[PDB]
Structure 1
Amino acid sequence: AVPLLNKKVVKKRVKRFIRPQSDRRITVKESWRRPKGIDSRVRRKFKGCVLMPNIGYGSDKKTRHYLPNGFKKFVVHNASELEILMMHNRTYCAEIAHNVSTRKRKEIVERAAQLDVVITNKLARLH
């Protein structure tokens, strides 16, 4: 399958937004939280501090949610759901759900080859 997308993917930022002071404290997890403190230097955006996520970082709508291979992911749990991508094989690629058995993955992979549907994790748990 030849991906239909042609515009290059431009990531405004590739680093993640780490919660402030999650390095200092084990109990403070890395998932982002907006600092609400009155004196918070991060909230006040002093230079040399952690950056906060804002809408300006939004990616181009034409390349948003596109994988590096040039397709968009759709999660499939069986062979029937795979057939939904027959007419979108140049736009959407399939990914087999993490909990599908190896026996049922062989059926999905074989069916995807007939439909020319890209499978992102076709080598999963077959050894």
Structure 2
Amino acid sequence: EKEFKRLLRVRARLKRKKPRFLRQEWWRYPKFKNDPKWRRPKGIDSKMRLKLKGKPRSPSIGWSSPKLVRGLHPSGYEEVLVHNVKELEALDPKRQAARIAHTVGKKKRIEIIKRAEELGIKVLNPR
């Protein structure tokens, strides 16, 4: 757990420092402001392509999270999407947390939550 906690803190700091990568001139037009995205600048005179100081930065392979904690919920568990009680049954309470699919109705959510709580399984969205 020592290394796990150290790397979890490292990832938290890294992803707090990381910026939001957005295409060039995203703020200038509604067509881009309403649909935020990142697109690689490919112009011959594109300052962002040249990577000049004072312009928005570009994504790089160095921003990746540490391998051990990559893709984990900030609480430290491994997320698993569940659509029914049978799917929830195949989960590991010690290391994985169930996320109930957005599409399942409250009727089924009731049994999913009951089974999770009687099995001691963490639920990220218990309602």
Alignment TM class, shorter chain as reference: 0.7 to 0.9
Q: CA RMSD in A?
A: 1.4
Q: Which residue does the alignment assign to 2:113?
A: 109
Aligned mates of 2:5, 2:56 — CA distance in 1: 35
Of 89, 95, 98, the match for 2:93: 89
Aligned mates of 2:66, 2:74 — CA distance in 1: 15
CA positional deviation for 1:8: 4.0
Q: Percent identity?
A: 39
| Equivalence map 1:17-32=2 (5 Å) | 17-28=21-32, 29-32=35-38
Of 53, 77, 102, the match for 1:71: 77
Of structures 1 and 2, the one scoring higher in RCO (CA 8 A, sep 6+) is: 1
Aligned mates of 1:13, 1:112 — CA distance in 2: 31
Aligned mates of 1:7, 1:76 — CA distance in 2: 30
Q: Deviations over 1:84-117 (max 9, x none)?
A: 10xx222110000001100100100000112211
Which one is further off, 35-44 or 23-32? Answer: 23-32
Between the two proteins, the alignment pairs up a number of residues equal to: 117
Stretches of structure 2 that go unaligned for 5 or more consecutive residues are none
Asked whether the equivalents of residues 76 and 95 of structure 1 are also in contact (C-alpha less than 8 Å), the reply is: yes
Report SS of the residue matched to 2:66: coil
TM-score by length of 1: 0.85
Stretches of structure 1 that go unaligned for 5 or more consecutive residues are none
Q: Deviations over 1:55-111 (max 9, x none)?
A: 0101100111111211111110000000110xx222110000001100100100000
Deviating beyond 3 angstroms after TM superposition, the runs of 4 or more aligned structure 1 residues are 5-8
Asked whether the equivalents of residues 7 and 63 of structure 1 are also in contact (C-alpha less than 8 Å), the reply is: no
Report SS of the residue matched to 1:95: strand
Q: Which residue does the alignment assign to 1:61?
A: 67
Report SS of the residue matched to 2:49: coil
Asked whether the equivalents of residues 81 and 99 of structure 2 are also in contact (C-alpha less than 8 Å), the reply is: yes
